[PDB]
Amino acid sequence: NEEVTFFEKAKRYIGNKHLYTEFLKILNLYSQDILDLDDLVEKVDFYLGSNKELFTWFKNFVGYEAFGPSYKRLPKSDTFMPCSGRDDMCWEVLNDEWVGHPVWASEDSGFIAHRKNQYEETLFKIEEERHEYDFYIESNLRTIQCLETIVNKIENMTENEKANFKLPPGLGHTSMTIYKKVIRKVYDKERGFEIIDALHEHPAVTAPVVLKRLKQKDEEWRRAQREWNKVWRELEQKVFFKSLDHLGLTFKQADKKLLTTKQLISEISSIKVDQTNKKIHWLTPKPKSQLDFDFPDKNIFYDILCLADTFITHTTAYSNPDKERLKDLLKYFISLFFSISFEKIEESLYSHKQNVSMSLLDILHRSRYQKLKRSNGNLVEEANSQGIIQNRSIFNLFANTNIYIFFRHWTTIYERLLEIKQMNERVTKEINTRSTVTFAKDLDLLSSQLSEMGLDFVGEDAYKQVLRLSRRLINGDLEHQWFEESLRQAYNNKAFKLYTIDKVTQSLVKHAHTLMTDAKTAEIMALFVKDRNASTTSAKDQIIYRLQVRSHMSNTENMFRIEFDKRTLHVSIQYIALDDLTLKEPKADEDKWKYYVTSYALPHPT
């Protein structure tokens, strides 16, 4: 009675058939007493584990050695090897039974390695040459000291003791192959063997000549060592930091490939389908809008406007009137949307540019801006009665793809600049206290190439230095490589995000241009202006807004709703499923059903 329903529930949950086929095969393997019981429970937990009630009912209803895949067991005939010094304990404690190996733990073919980009390869080569020279130097010295002491001890005797003196194998030292290796390196290995047995036989005639040969070779090798130490140090300083960022060489190609339109809508589509496919599970509450941005610091906007103004004054793609229209559109939009007074914008630009030493709709229909700048039953009644929002604080904007991608670019730039402006305090305090020891200053051991061109973060502040350097890059006053290197050494390889601070600005300018060159988006922004300038509204007015803006683009295009909260300076972006709630889902039956029966008043369908 309840179990037919169980098999129907299982077929529903699994959703597919091949996986249901395997589910039934598990069940039958259990049925013919092949599978254990709790092995069946564990095998089904991979199927009905995302459900709690179904699997707990299954638990209450069904009434519920080399376990490591790396080792083998050898017979007790491979554990029989001499092992002389193995006492009674090293038999009881150690293990001779089980065996492992990286040739059959890798399945006879494997062992990938990391990538280790080219600059680390050159650094490794430099370190290897260093090690080689150091090894030969130290070995030559280590044999020279012993040969010197035996020479100094052997000459103080008479001719008789010299004639009968001989050295035992090892020269009385603790190592036996050092001097052999050194002499075979320097002395023509055949001649090296004959001279080494001559040294073992009669040192009184062979030790001085080998000693002086080793001395001259040592001084030659040391001269070569310093003359190569110069180049080693210079190349190591050239390519050290370039090798310490595993993302910085692939950010100028990841911020141009993962910052297109497809990906930009794809992340929000993905969080949407996640919300639905996981909302099928009923016990979870209904999730609200897709994306969340938060804007606690308002001063970066003037910096973004400064970057945009710098680009537009530099670029040659647009003509001067177009440049002014772009500047004024950006200024007024970011003053209106984020509710920043234009007078405060002008005071901020006053504070900014003095240290370097009509409405928005008037711009929407560009002719207006040209003229301006050349002049210089009871149900619906009682539903609309209660709930009137006075002193509007939460605003909304209904947008096609262009406004959304533009606001996306804006948020990307703001988030990157806020990252580095949150690091600024500590990184500046650190770079102010660089304790450079003069012992490296005098020996030319420090590279002042970054300090000579002024790109070094001297005790001036760091964030303003980033802004100024990025502006110099945008103008074309500084190459990309040196800006990158300044940002590597200055902060760390921790601030790699700002290598594309000019391309993202160019993209934001292109989108601010599309935001008024198109006709549909111009009218959508005009409706946005008309709603934003309003100070009080009702749900019916919001439905009029949504339907009017949807009337502009076709029934195949997407639509996004940007909900701006002025009390806490928040932005919430919602993907609009064409027949989803134009406002956010509440929790009250009252609000929901009265909102829909007031939408019923308009002749548009439900």
């Binding site: 376990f67 490591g68 895949p69 790396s70 080792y71 090897m81 001499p82 092992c83 002389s84 010094g85 193995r86 006492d87 304990m89 090293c90 404690v93 150690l94 293990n95 089980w98 492992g100 990286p102 733990a105 890798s106 494997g110 062992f111 990938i112 390695a113 990391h114 280790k116 680390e120 490794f124 370190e127 290897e128 260093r130 090690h131 150091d134 090894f135 130290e138 603790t174 190592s175 036996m176 192959t177 050092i178 130490n229 140090r233 190591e236 300083q237 050290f240 310490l244 960022d245 595993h246 993302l247 304790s435 020891v437 012992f439 490296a440 420090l446 760390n492 390889n493 921790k494 790699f496």
Partner: protein, 385 residues
């Protein structure tokens, strides 16, 4: 049961005062693996120069361990392999063409010069330090020449020819009931795990990168067989592990281990291929994120021993071992390096800083939650020691 945290700097404890011993054989650096071969004992010479130019010799005793003899290496190995080691040299290699294949020392771990000599030095260091720990005239025993945890019983594999970790640990086991081996190398120490896989007097704890990565061994489900079940902890991680992640994983798992297993002696293998900018490992640790583990294990205050390990770029490993010996004498070393013979190694700033990369840490808190929950589930059964 994992939870991310910040990383406060390393602070020395005043009460935990130890008499350290530092073992160095003046010849360890004169045995060259070869032209380009990724292992050099040279890094021990540099580490030594850094350790002694800080004036750290006034804080600890410096010894020279007598190299091991053929009848003490065999406390782990088989006698035919030991005799091959003693006889083989780059000239007679064509003479043992049927033995170079059986023991796997012809090309993978080649014969260069003084192979038996370097192995004897390392084994002697390890065993002598373990013995000085026993008789009670020390608390720590530093040795950067040992730590060859890849060498098997009758074959070398992974540039490890004498598995001196095991000889030293056996020398420790001759008096001590329980030994805990903490392995923070980026690779898996399959030698010291397979060698003590079925025993309950030795507990290994190995924090290694798992993937298609050498030695391809060390899953989460390898908790020993027989009487050594739940007495082998493997923590397999992913790339890019950083200081805060590694600390938030290492601190709780090790506190639980030392809370239930309660070892009487520790062997910490602080290899240095788990650092950033290395040659074969893929982690992204910093010099302080690697010495935090040593400081935490020292915080417990039981007989301890620091061993060497991997380390394929010499400068980071030299500076790391210098800083670890520094905080092992209960001082936080100054970050400005003094003048040493190998000064020109430590470009470009000439300070005691190892700098992490911006590598992407791919260890999500859900994966580490799963892993540490599995590991605590296993560890539930190692209480009655």
């Amino acid at each position: 049961v994992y939870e991310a945290t910040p990383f406060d700097p390393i602070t020395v404890k005043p009460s935990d005062k130890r008499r350290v011993a530092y073992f160095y054989d003046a010849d360890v650096g004169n045995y060259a693996y070869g032209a380009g071969h990724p292992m050099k004992p040279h890094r021990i010479r540099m580490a030594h120069s850094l350790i002694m130019n800080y004036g750290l010799y006034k804080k600890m005793e410096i010894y020279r361990a007598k190299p091991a003899t053929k009848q003490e290496m065999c406390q782990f190995h088989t006698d035919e392999y030991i005799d091959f080691l003693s006889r083989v040299t780059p000239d007679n290699l064509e003479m043992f063409k049927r033995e170079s294949v059986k023991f796997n020392v012809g090309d993978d771990c080649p014969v260069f010069d003084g192979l038996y000599e370097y192995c004897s030095i390392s084994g002697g260091g390890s065993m002598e330090g373990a013995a000085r720990l026993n008789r009670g005239k020390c608390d720590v025993a530093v040795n950067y020449a040992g730590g060859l945890h890849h060498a098997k019983k009758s074959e070398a594999s992974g540039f490890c020819y004498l598995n001196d970790i095991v000889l030293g640990i056996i020398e420790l086991l001759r008096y001590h009931p329980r030994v805990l081996y903490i392995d923070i190398d980026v690779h898996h120490g399959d030698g010291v795990e397979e060698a003590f896989y079925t025993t309950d007097r030795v507990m290994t704890c190995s924090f290694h990168k798992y993937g298609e990565f050498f030695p391809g061994t060390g899953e989460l489900r390898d908790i020993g067989v027989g009487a050594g079940k739940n007495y082998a902890v493997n923590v397999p991680l992913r790339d890019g592990i950083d200081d805060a992640t590694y600390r938030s994983v290492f601190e709780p798992v090790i506190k639980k281990i030392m809370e239930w297993y309660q070892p009487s002696a520790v062997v910490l293998q602080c290899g240095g291929d788990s650092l950033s900018g290395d040659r074969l490992g893929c982690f992204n640790l910093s010099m302080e994120g690697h010495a935090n583990c040593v400081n935490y294990v020292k915080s417990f205050g039981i007989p301890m021993m620091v061993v060497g390990g991997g380390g394929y770029t010499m400068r980071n490993v030299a500076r790391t071992w210098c800083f670890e010996t520094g905080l092992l004498n209960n001082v936080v070393l100054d970050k400005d390096l003094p003048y040493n013979e190998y000064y020109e190694y430590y470009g470009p700033d000439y300070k005691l800083s190892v700098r992490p990369s911006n590598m992407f840490n791919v260890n999500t808190p859900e994966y580490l939650d799963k892993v540490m929950t599995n590991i605590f589930a296993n560890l539930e059964n190692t209480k009655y020691a």
